[PDB]
Amino acid sequence: APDSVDYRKKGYVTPVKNQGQCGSCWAFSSVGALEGQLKKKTGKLLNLSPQNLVDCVSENDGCGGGYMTNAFQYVQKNRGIDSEDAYPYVGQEESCMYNPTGKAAKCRGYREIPEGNEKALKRAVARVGPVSVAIDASLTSFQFYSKGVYYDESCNSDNLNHAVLAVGYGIQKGNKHWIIKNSWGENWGNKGYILMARNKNNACGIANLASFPKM
């Protein structure tokens, strides 16, 4: 469709994951944006290791939460991130066991979308690929999402408490959206995904903490 993109159809997006009981959403957001850039740069991707991030990004709080920017900084400084197959997800924080022989991607830094600018976010998604985004995911209504374009007037754009991955944008039945990849399993939402309101005054803080890795 004109003025839309869906990166899942272009091979930039791996299967939806389940973080389990661990607060590693940021590690799944981060590996997601890295996966997209792997495909962009090399023509192929593989699953990258969230557990590598949870365990080794000491600036974040493991299963207590974190920021995607810190993970990108880590992959750059560490000269790599392992594959999921080299360093599998266990759902709790463990000692850092990074080994460069399982290295599957690299990072030369990151950029942040100007705060609150959805138009800038759309150009990022159009010109880069999948972009890491933070949202207010606290509402009951967010959690019980199944179909349509999500909008709730109660969403607080200043309460950013959950990390997700913007993998496209479009319009459905006259409602502009972002295609959002979550890490609560394929059972959640619509096969792991949520369509969130686009251009509805930065609904849920969608454009407030957006970043992508340079590769």
Ligand SMILES: *C(#N)C1=NC([C][C][C]N2[C][C][C][C][C]2)=[C]C(C2=[C]C(C(F)(F)F)=[C][C]=[C]2)=N1
């Ligand atoms: C993700 N996952 C995640 N987890 C946490 C800790 C657990 C939060 N809590 C939410 C309600 C129900 C059960 C558990 C914290 C964060 C977090 C993420 C961000 C970011 F901006 F990066 F999106 C900011 C603050 C906290 N994410």
